[PDB]
Amino acid sequence: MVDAFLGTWKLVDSKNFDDYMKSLGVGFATRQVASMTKPTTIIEKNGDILTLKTHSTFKNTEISFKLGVEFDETTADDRKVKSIVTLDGGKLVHLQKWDGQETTLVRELIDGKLILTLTHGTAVCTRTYEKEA
């Protein structure tokens, strides 16, 4: 039920990503490069399994998961977390847990754009991705 999220997407706007990274304890030099990086996110499905690739000139990541089933993840900033992804209100909600901390990565489609909202602590970052053909 994930289907309009599938495809290749490019970052075209970012708000408050430095705040989000700093909340996670990312160091200034990494935040600095990250603030100038425009990733490509690729979301594909094969049956019940989603694979989400994030590619850039700085960091790359890839995760595979089934909706609603917890998976181990090692994030771009090297946190080892317990993750689960679901659909909630038509939004793809990714919850990460570690050390009693939590962060959510929420994706929603608004006027054909994918809006990624990243929340940790009080920090709320909004990143906008546009679909590639």
Ligand SMILES: CCCCCCCCCCCCCCCCC(=O)O
């Ligand atoms: C893999 C490319 C991610 C962007 C540059 C590196 C950022 C480091 C801080 C990582 C924080 C947790 C992941 C954020 C993902 C942001 C996104 O998918 O747009």
